[PDB]
Amino acid sequence: FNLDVDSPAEYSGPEGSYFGFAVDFFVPSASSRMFLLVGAPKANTTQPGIVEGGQVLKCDWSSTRRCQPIEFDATGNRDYAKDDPLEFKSHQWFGASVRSKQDKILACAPLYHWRTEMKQEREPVGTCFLQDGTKTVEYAPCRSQDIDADGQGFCQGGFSIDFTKADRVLLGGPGSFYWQGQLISDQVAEIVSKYDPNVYSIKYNNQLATRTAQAIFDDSYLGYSVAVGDFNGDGIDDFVSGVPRAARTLGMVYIYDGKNMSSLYNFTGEQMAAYFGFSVAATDINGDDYADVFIGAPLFMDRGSDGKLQEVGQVSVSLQRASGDFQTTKLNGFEVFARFGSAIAPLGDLDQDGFNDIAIAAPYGGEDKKGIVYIFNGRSTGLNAVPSQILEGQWAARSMPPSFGYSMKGATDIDKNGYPDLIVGAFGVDRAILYRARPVITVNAGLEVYPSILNQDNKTCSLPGTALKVSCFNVRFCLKADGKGVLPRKLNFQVELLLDKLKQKGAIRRALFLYSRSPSHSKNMTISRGGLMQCEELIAYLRDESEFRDKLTPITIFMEYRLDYRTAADTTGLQPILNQFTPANISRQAHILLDCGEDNVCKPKLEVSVDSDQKKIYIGDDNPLTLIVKAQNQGEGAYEAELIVSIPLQADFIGVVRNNEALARLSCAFKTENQTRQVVCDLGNPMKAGTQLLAGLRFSVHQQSEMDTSVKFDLQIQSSNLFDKVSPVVSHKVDLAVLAAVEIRGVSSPDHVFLPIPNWEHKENPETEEDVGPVVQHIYELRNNGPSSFSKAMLHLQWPYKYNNNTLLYILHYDIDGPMNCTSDMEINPLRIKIDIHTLGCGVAQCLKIVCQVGRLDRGKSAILYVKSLLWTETFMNKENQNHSYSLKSSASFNVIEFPYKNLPIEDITNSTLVTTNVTWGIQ
Amino acid sequence: GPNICTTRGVSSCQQCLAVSPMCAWCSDEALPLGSPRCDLKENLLKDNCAPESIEFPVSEARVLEDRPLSDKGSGDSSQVTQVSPQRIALRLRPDDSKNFSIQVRQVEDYPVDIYYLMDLSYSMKDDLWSIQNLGTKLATQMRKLTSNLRIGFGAFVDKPVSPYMYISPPEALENPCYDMKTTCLPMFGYKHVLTLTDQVTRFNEEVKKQSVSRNRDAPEGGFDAIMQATVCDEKIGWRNDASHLLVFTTDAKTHIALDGRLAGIVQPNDGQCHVGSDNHYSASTTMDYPSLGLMTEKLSQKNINLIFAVTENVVNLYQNYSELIPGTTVGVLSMDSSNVLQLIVDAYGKIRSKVELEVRDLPEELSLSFNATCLNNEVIPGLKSCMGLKIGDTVSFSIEAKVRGCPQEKEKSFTIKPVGFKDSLIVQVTFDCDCACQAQAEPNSHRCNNGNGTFECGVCRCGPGWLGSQCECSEEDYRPSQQDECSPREGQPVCSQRGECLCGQCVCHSSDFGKITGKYCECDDFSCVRYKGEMCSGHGQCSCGDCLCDSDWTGYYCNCTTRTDTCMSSNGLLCSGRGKCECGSCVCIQPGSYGDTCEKCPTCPDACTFKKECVECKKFDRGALHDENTCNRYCRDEIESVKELKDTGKDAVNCTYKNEDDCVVRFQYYEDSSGKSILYVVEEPECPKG
Amino acid sequence: SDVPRDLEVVAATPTSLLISWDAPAVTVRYYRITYGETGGNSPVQEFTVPGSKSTATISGLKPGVDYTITVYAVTGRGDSPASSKPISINYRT
Ligand SMILES: *[C@@H]1O[C@H](CO)[C@@H](O[C@@H]2O[C@H](CO)[C@@H](O[C@@H]3O[C@H](CO[C@@H]4O[C@H](CO)[C@@H](O[C@H]5O[C@H](CO)[C@@H](O)[C@H](O)[C@@H]5O)[C@H](O)[C@@H]4O)[C@@H](O)[C@H](O[C@H]4O[C@H](CO)[C@@H](O)[C@H](O)[C@@H]4O)[C@@H]3O)[C@H](O)[C@H]2NC(C)=O)[C@H](O)[C@H]1NC(C)=O
Ligand SMILES: *[C@@H]1O[C@H](CO)[C@@H](O[C@@H]2O[C@H](CO)[C@@H](O[C@@H]3O[C@H](CO)[C@@H](O)[C@H](O[C@H]4O[C@H](CO)[C@@H](O)[C@H](O)[C@@H]4O)[C@@H]3O)[C@H](O)[C@H]2NC(C)=O)[C@H](O)[C@H]1NC(C)=O
Ligand SMILES: *[C@@H]1O[C@H](CO)[C@@H](O[C@@H]2O[C@H](CO)[C@@H](O[C@@H]3O[C@H](CO)[C@@H](O)[C@H](O[C@H]4O[C@H](CO)[C@@H](O)[C@H](O)[C@@H]4O)[C@@H]3O)[C@H](O)[C@H]2NC(C)=O)[C@H](O)[C@H]1NC(C)=O
Ligand SMILES: *[C@@H]1O[C@H](CO)[C@@H](O[C@@H]2O[C@H](CO)[C@@H](O)[C@H](O)[C@H]2NC(C)=O)[C@H](O)[C@H]1NC(C)=O
Ligand SMILES: *[C@@H]1O[C@H](CO)[C@@H](O[C@@H]2O[C@H](CO)[C@@H](O)[C@H](O)[C@H]2NC(C)=O)[C@H](O)[C@H]1NC(C)=O
Ligand SMILES: *[C@@H]1O[C@H](CO)[C@@H](O[C@@H]2O[C@H](CO)[C@@H](O)[C@H](O)[C@H]2NC(C)=O)[C@H](O)[C@H]1NC(C)=O
Ligand SMILES: *[C@@H]1O[C@H](CO)[C@@H](O[C@@H]2O[C@H](CO)[C@@H](O)[C@H](O)[C@H]2NC(C)=O)[C@H](O)[C@H]1NC(C)=O
Ligand SMILES: *[C@@H]1O[C@H](CO)[C@@H](O)[C@H](O)[C@H]1NC(C)=O
Ligand SMILES: *[C@@H]1O[C@H](CO)[C@@H](O)[C@H](O)[C@H]1NC(C)=O
Ligand SMILES: *[C@@H]1O[C@H](CO)[C@@H](O)[C@H](O)[C@H]1NC(C)=O
Ligand SMILES: [Mn+2]
Ligand SMILES: [Mn+2]
Numbered sequence A: 001f002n003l004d005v006d007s008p009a010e011y012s013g014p015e016g017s018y019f020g021f022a023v024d025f026f027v028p029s030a031s032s033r034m035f036l037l038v039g040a041p042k043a044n045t046t047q048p049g050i051v052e053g054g055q056v057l058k059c060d061w062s063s064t065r066r067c068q069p070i071e072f073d074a075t076g077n078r079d080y081a082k083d084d085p086l087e088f089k090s091h092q093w094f095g096a097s098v099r100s101k102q103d104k105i106l107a108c109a110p111l112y113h114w115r116t117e118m119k120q121e122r123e124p125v126g127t128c129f130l131q132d133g134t135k136t137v138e139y140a141p142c143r144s145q146d147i148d149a150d151g152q153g154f155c156q157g158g159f160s161i162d163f164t165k166a167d168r169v170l171l172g173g174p175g176s177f178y179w180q181g182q183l184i185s186d187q188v189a190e191i192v193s194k195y196d197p198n199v200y201s202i203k204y205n206n207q208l209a210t211r212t213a214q215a216i217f218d219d220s221y222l223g224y225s226v227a228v229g230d231f232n233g234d235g236i237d238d239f240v241s242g243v244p245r246a247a248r249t250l251g252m253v254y255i256y257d258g259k260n261m262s263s264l265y266n267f268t269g270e271q272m273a274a275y276f277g278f279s280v281a282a283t284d285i286n287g288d289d290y291a292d293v294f295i296g297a298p299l300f301m302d303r304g305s306d307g308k309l310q311e312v313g314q315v316s317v318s319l320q321r322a323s324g325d326f327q328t329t330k331l332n333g334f335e336v337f338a339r340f341g342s343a344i345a346p347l348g349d350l351d352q353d354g355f356n357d358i359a360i361a362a363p364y365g366g367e368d369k370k371g372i373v374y375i376f377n378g379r380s381t382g383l384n385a386v387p388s389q390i391l392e393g394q395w396a397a398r399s400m401p402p403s404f405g406y407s408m409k410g411a412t413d414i415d416k417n418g419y420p421d422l423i424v425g426a427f428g429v430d431r432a433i434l435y436r437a438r439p440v441i442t443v444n445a446g447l448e449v450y451p452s453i454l455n456q457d458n459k460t461c462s463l464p465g466t467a468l469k470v471s472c473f474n475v476r477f478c479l480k481a482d483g484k485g486v487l488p489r490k491l492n493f494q495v496e497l498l499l500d501k502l503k504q505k506g507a508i509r510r511a512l513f514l515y516s517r518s519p520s521h522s523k524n525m526t527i528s529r530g531g532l533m534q535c536e537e538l539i540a541y542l543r544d545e546s547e548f549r550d551k552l553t554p555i556t557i558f559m560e561y562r563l564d565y566r567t568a569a570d571t572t573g574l575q576p577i578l579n580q581f582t583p584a585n586i587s588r589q590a591h592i593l594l595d596c597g598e599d600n601v602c603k604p605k606l607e608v609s610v611d612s613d614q615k616k617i618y619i620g621d622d623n624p625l626t627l628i629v630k631a632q633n634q635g636e637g638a639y640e641a642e643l644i645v646s647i648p649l650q651a652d653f654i655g656v657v658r659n660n661e662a663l664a665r666l667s668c669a670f671k672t673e674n675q676t677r678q679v680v681c682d683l684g685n686p687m688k689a690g691t692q693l694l695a696g697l698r699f700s701v702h703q704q705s706e707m708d709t710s711v712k713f714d715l716q717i718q719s720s721n722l723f724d725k726v727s728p729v730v731s732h733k734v735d736l737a738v739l740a741a742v743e744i745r746g747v748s749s750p751d752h753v754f755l756p757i758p759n760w761e762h763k764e765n766p767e768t769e770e771d772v773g774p775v776v777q778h779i780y781e782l783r784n785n786g787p788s789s790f791s792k793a794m795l796h797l798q799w800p801y802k803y804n805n806n807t808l809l810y811i812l813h814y815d816i817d818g819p820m821n822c823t824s825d826m827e828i829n830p831l832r833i834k835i836d837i838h839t840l841g842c843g844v845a846q847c848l849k850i851v852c853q854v855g856r857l858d859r860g861k862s863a864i865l866y867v868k869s870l871l872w873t874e875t876f877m878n879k880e881n882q883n884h885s886y887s888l889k890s891s892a893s894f895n896v897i898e899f900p901y902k903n904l905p906i907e908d909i910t911n912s913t914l915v916t917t918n919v920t921w922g923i924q
Numbered sequence B: 001g002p003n004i005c006t007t008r009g010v011s012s013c014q015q016c017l018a019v020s021p022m023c024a025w026c027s028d029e030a031l032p033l034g035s036p037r038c039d040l041k042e043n044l045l046k047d048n049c050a051p052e053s054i055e056f057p058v059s060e061a062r063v064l065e066d067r068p069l070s071d072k073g074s075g076d077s078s079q080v081t082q083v084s085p086q087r088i089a090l091r092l093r094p095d096d097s098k099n100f101s102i103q104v105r106q107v108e109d110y111p112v113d114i115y116y117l118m119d120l121s122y123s124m125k126d127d128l129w130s131i132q133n134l135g136t137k138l139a140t141q142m143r144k145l146t147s148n149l150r151i152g153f154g155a156f157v158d159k160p161v162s163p164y165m166y167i168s169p170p171e172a173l174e175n176p177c178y179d180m181k182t183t184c185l186p187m188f189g190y191k192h193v194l195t196l197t198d199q200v201t202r203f204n205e206e207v208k209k210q211s212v213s214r215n216r217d218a219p220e221g222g223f224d225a226i227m228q229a230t231v232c233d234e235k236i237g238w239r240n241d242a243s244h245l246l247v248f249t250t251d252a253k254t255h256i257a258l259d260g261r262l263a264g265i266v267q268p269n270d271g272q273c274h275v276g277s278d279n280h281y282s283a284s285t286t287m288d289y290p291s292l293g294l295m296t297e298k299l300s301q302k303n304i305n306l307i308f309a310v311t312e313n314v315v316n317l318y319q320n321y322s323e324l325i326p327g328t329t330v331g332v333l334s335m336d337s338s339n340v341l342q343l344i345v346d347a348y349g350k351i352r353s354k355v356e357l358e359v360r361d362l363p364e365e366l367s368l369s370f371n372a373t374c375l376n377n378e379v380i381p382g383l384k385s386c387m388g389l390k391i392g393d394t395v396s397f398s399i400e401a402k403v404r405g406c407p408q409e410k411e412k413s414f415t416i417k418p419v420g421f422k423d424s425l426i427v428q429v430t431f432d433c434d435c436a437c438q439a440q441a442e443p444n445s446h447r448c449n450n451g452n453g454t455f456e457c458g459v460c461r462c463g464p465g466w467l468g469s470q471c472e473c474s475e476e477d478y479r480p481s482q483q484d485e486c487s488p489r490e491g492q493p494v495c496s497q498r499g500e501c502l503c504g505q506c507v508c509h510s511s512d513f514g515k516i517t518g519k520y521c522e523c524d525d526f527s528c529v530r531y532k533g534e535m536c537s538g539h540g541q542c543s544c545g546d547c548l549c550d551s552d553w554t555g556y557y558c559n560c561t562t563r564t565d566t567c568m569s570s571n572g573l574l575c576s577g578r579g580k581c582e583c584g585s586c587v588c589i590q591p592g593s594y595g596d597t598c599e600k601c602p603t604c605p606d607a608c609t610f611k612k613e614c615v616e617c618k619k620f621d622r623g624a625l626h627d628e629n630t631c632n633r634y635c636r637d638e639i640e641s642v643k644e645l646k647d648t649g650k651d652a653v654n655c656t657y658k659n660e661d662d663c664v665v666r667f668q669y670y671e672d673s674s675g676k677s678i679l680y681v682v683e684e685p686e687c688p689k690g
Numbered sequence C: 001s002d003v004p005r006d007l008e009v010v011a012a013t014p015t016s017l018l019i020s021w022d023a024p025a026v027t028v029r030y031y032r033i034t035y036g037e038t039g040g041n042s043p044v045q046e047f048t049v050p051g052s053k054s055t056a057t058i059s060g061l062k063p064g065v066d067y068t069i070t071v072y073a074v075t076g077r078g079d080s081p082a083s084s085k086p087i088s089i090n091y092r093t
């Protein structure tokens, strides 16, 4: 919120050069000056026979906004033979990626083409150049004896580059190995020391590079974007690269170890063609010292209010934790086709809040495709997802979109104001803009009113112009100003005081200042540092009792401060801005003395009562807990009476009951501060004697861990009176109950089997299902529905194994879905396998019992048992009374034996169900 | 007695028109005072007060143009009408709603335009057998559904730039095949070949001439061709009032947007027509591949249906791609089974098997509700689409239009149309907000009393600080001079606390974080009901402690959603037919059914138990599915009676049951072979003897 | 240049078969074995085997019916079909 948008620094390169396609800071160690590095990959060069070779310019921040190109190559290409160009610098896009660490700078030409050394060709291997002050070396890892599309010939290395804290270059390229992509890393000192101008393919020691993979990974575009950060125990930055065409175009982000190229972690997009991994970034946003991952998906499509698909873009935020398991949150774009996740730039800590902040840009968003950049402050909870400021680039469109964004670099203080600044490049207009942060002054103000209770008949101080006695009081207000970074020694505030702000709106003015004779007064103030609060003493009187109708309405003294901005010597001008969330004013109320008794002081008797209403609230559900409160004042009037409802932990406020006539519509607010969450409700200002109120308060209780027994609420009435200003503390609790509705269901497929059975031949020694009979399958489901969950339970199955020594339903194999183990008292498949109505239950037949152990079925989940059996055809017909209706009845019982919540009274859950398979005759 | 109108809108005329749509207003200053002027309905008719001066705007929805629905797609019809009505005039007073209805019909013999996009890259030389015949065979199976259809085609390879193309020794520029000891054609972007015409001979002759080219990048980027064939109307020749089919064929995967950055292409696809008279994509080198969203947007604007006909290996890819572009189907290209012949007609059947309404240019201030009547007055609510349809069927939609306030507009318009059709319903929107006699006011001062005052139609109210029945208020305030019943009963304190009651009209602003209004100032406009950390869940405004939810949101807390999309299952039926959709989440109502889409049903009737009802329906004409006339609509599964033969067996479910005639019917059904509901019923079931 | 062939028959039992061939001389991801009856009969089944092994094995019990096999060597990267050409043998049970 502290970026200054009124007067930034605008740098412009030649048109058509894509000036601003890449930006970074140049902070040399040999100079106290700093510079802006801007890439212009389509710029023309003095290089002989080279058209649009591209270049990188050094822009001076001091004055004149003048930019000068940094000279890397300045030469022609090369020769393999008489007329056989050994390389092609034309349209090589040199400067498409620019990165700088300390005095080292690295620029690359991803479209540089080679021809190699074997056969005539043009292969976009790409190349880079590393220069330190004087010496310039060429760096082209993908230019090697591994050629064509199978090798590194099409790699276009230098597409994305980055530096580590160990001065190791991380360089990716999408085209290696039929566009699988590749990451190549080398020591900076090794690059320069090993450089031989007479050797085109240079072998570097201690090079970390990914190898080719299976062709399934082709066209992944690994190395499209890269970033650095450490995600393991070591201090050495580890490699992070987005690979947008990976995972059947879903998009992925690969993380590799900094020690060796071994893979560490993976991310995957949830939507195809969204280009998940188009841009990546690494910062710690929660200040927990663990770097956290940011992944851009500018083509991602969310769904609007009507549910239609629309492309707003999406950015993935993954917080690294102690164990290493990321906690990932997503945020979406705002304008359609704006491509929100196009560029993700860490800007450091912009506000100096102690937590780093980040910037995300939508280059084709804003007003008529002008571009827009959103910045987001981080905090302890992680990255807070709402723009604290919006950067809207204003530039016309000549040929292509003036992409504002698509190139950003932050986390560097160029003005030396103690605050990091931000560069946003726009290659559509061939321009780059530098925004400067502001000092962020945090002002602490306070207001105290003297004898806040006014006695109408106490006329002590009066000097209103040949004085006559009048009732008086003093207004004292103090002002503290402090900040971080560079900022002037003293600040100038403009304070405005308003008396009885509630009135004066088509109403009588009830209080005036003594000397001013006015309801309002203003004064110019000056503070220097924190804890230096400077106050002023003003005397405001109260008009005569007969001049107005008086009121029970309190007199609200309203202080407002301005802080006109004159600051930041030279450097155009830089206006410090106040804190993000800060009061622009404060109020305090005074009351006229009325009905306080002969003691001339109001001493209320406050008492708060509460009824249980619902006695029980169940564990896993969200419950409509309503508390009826009885607020009584049996004493004298209590000023600024408020009902304080302390809701701990899982409890969150819903609202107040408007539907009930017997209950009050009193306005309540949910307030969290000083590590205390609670509900405040106005009982009246003042709350008059004999006042009794009834109002309900709805909440929703989920849980905190487990086995908390009951939940406790705290109710107290408090007021601003000098004595007896509070009620007692009345706490009310409601017991948590365990209720989990568990049902057991079963089906048989088929429900019936019609005898005789097609193609049935009895075999003396059965071999397959064809030799036994059809397939009867019983499915039993044990499902937990109720809010609570059970930790362990038992399941009993009774199967009609045999009737009179011959098999009824021959069980082959049973499977289990969910958390359940099962055991059969009789061996399944003793013979193995390849692959009126008379009721037959396990009671009247031989029983094959299956006992299963079940555990940990939560609210949603359930447990299943699939029993696949063959009907034994050989048993039927015969002396089995061929024509008779048989129903095969299998029973299943369940019993819940344990619960995860202890110290809570529990009740056993048991129920049974039966599954029948009816075998009958269609012809008699 | 006292009502909502007499408690809020007594301040003015226009402010009285916006309290509730039931409120009214009284002009005709004869016999003033004695009653509120903002009362409603016949309460102002109780008092005489009934000249033309009475103000009671009534929201109207009137049909301007309604032509009858057409029957056949010939040229002797009206013009052609698949939507009744066509133009509707809508007049709305603030915070009021009126509802209307619309019929949509798929008409028989509707002309069909088919444009072919063919991949000519080297990977397609093996699959080039499908281009042969085509126009001759394309017509034959299309003759059943549509006479007077027109065909045409164009080709694409890839972007003729950096790595995609061969910049290798110059003989590979003219002949990209120098390696492999063969000769092929030079590559190109999208290339228009044959505009839509009548002659199939002109088609087959020009089709056989096509040969294959070569590029080295595996994704071919046919999306470039899709974008151009959609946005170029004249070059392609897309007709109007005809079905637009764009069929896409490729051997392998495709480029998506942002892929062109490797080629040095940073310019996003503008979605314009860059095809010149030379029938080439001029911007193929200069601008990137079109994104799915831009393809989706432009596809529906031109009412063009996209069809994916791809190789079996890459089918699941484009099948997954098609889910992101609703209204597009995918089919398998193979030398066995159905192939091109019955493929396209099935794809065209799928497109015409669904009817969904799309809304263009809908103003922000009003929202639309949809109950869908698809099958014989089933009045399914909350849904703007009907599935499971055949050509010749007609569906109905009831639509409610409710506006929140009115932004003092003259006229707006929005279009409701079925997706993929030219026929549309245009709704003209006009808002009645200002009183008719408001313009009669003569603006200058002294019109009411003592000069320096305000006025309106049947209204006098003095200015700030003056604020009286004619002109007087506090800064004298006398005695209260009445309680003015600032409360509904005199046994209650001053009006809604909040700055007490002054000089009759209760003045209570207090300026605190919002605006406070009312006759007694009972309307806070800021204090409201909150669901989770936000007021009205951030999806609605707050008026007098009540939430007015934004479009596509309902409920007291405004946390309920109109969307049925997240309630849709894999089969396309909401909640898998096992439940009902409420607030965007399915509530399953069936024994043993659960899941987000209610797709999980481990314990419930399986296979035949559902389908044995359909065979009695279709084959035996026996009821319980034939009673509600849901036979042809519900189960479209084709039933072919087989003679005595249950085959050697594949993945299948063999199912038997006994009918009303006590005969055992045996049948079975195959699972998906390219997908189908095919069902075989054995003729001559088993019955008793005699 | 690059193709399967040199197709032998090694192991013979009362059923099944064993097929061996020579490598296409270029890097191979895997192979695809396809077989069916002679004439214009029913469609053909196919399976897969790795590319570092020159052999394959298939199960099942069927009569001869003038059986003929095919094996697909799948090698393709970039815009080209992932195959070279199907080759075949003719053997009876
Ligand atoms: C994040 O996502 C990344 C992308 O998915 C993951 O990277 C992927 O991880 C896979 C798991 O490690 C890995 O698969 C392994 O590949 C290697 C490749 O070495 C081979 O060496 C041989 C050289 O000729 C060839 O092997 C034969 O097999 C292939 C089929 O794979 C045949 O087609 C060949 O003709 C050849 O006969 C290959 O050409 C290849 O170059 C394999 O060695 C590994 O084998 C493992 O499994 C076998 C059992 O199948 C074990 O016996 C053996 O000991 C190994 O454990 C794997 O197949 C992917 O290559 C890799 N892809 C990329 C682009 O990095 C990444 O792991 C993931 N990280 C996290 C943290 O989730
Ligand atoms: C860097 O320098 C290079 C070369 O010095 C420069 O590229 C040049 O750009 C111009 C214009 O952008 C090119 O000139 C064109 O030539 C073609 C023929 O090849 C013409 O058709 C072009 O348009 C003409 O004709 C149109 C009618 O058909 C007219 O409407 C139009 O006005 C023109 O008259 C145009 O003349 C020139 O070929 C290149 N040279 C190259 C590529 O070598 C580049 O613009 C410079 N970039 C920067 C950032 O400085
Ligand atoms: C009739 O009205 C007059 C005023 O109109 C009133 O005189 C006021 O009396 C109160 C107390 O009775 C005074 O308040 C205190 O005055 C002492 C004087 O030294 C101060 O020290 C006190 O300072 C407090 O606040 C400081 C913060 O600013 C604290 O740091 C400090 O520790 C004290 O807490 C306090 O101001 C008040 O100043 C006078 N006012 C005037 C104008 O004299 C009189 O009392 C009323 N009559 C009756 C019978 O009460
Ligand atoms: C790659 O680097 C990592 C850490 O620098 C190492 O990975 C170890 O691999 C061995 C395999 O024998 C494991 O026993 C260790 O637990 C791994 N350590 C980790 C994951 O931190 C290893 O030194 C390097 N080489 C590899 C993995 O081949
Ligand atoms: C005085 O301060 C208050 C709160 O500090 C501000 O008034 C509103 O405060 C709410 C938050 O409770 C904001 O949402 C509003 O945007 C604020 N209103 C305005 C006009 O800023 C404000 O800083 C000051 N308000 C007045 C009336 O002076
Ligand atoms: C077991 O489950 C049944 C549901 O199958 C429930 O019993 C129902 O309610 C009463 C018992 O309160 C029975 O008399 C009814 O017959 C049951 N309703 C039915 C079957 O629809 C209950 O959850 C459990 N009942 C017992 C006795 O354990
Ligand atoms: C959709 O169906 C409902 C049937 O309930 C129609 O009527 C609504 O019914 C309830 C009140 O019983 C409420 O949702 C609305 O007040 C009713 N709408 C009215 C009266 O217009 C509803 O109208 C139907 N929607 C459309 C667009 O026809
Ligand atoms: C099933 O048994 C395994 C060990 O055999 C055990 O690890 C697992 O926890 C058991 N599951 C249940 C639900 O008892
Ligand atoms: C509005 O309500 C229902 C919607 O189906 C309908 O019966 C009624 O006629 C509609 N009213 C108008 C005026 O269309
Ligand atoms: C297609 O999508 C499904 C789920 O939507 C996924 O399981 C499958 O792997 C995907 N396959 C392809 C080829 O996209
Ligand atoms: Mn590390
Ligand atoms: Mn962190």
Ligand SMILES: [Mn+2]
Pocket: A412, A413, A414, A415, A416, A417, A418, A419, A420, A421, A436, A437
């Ligand atoms: Mn700075």
Ligand SMILES: [Mn+2]
Pocket: A596, A597, A598, A599, A600, A601, A602, A603, A636
């Ligand atoms: Mn007292």
Ligand SMILES: [Mn+2]
Pocket: B123, B124, B125, B126, B127, B251, B311, C081
């Ligand atoms: Mn092919």
Ligand SMILES: [Mn+2]
Pocket: B157, B158, B164, B215, B216, B217, B218, B219, B220, B221, C079
């Ligand atoms: Mn290609």
Ligand SMILES: [Mn+2]
Pocket: B119, B121, B122, B123, B124, B218, B220, B251, B252, C079, C080
């Ligand atoms: Mn191809």
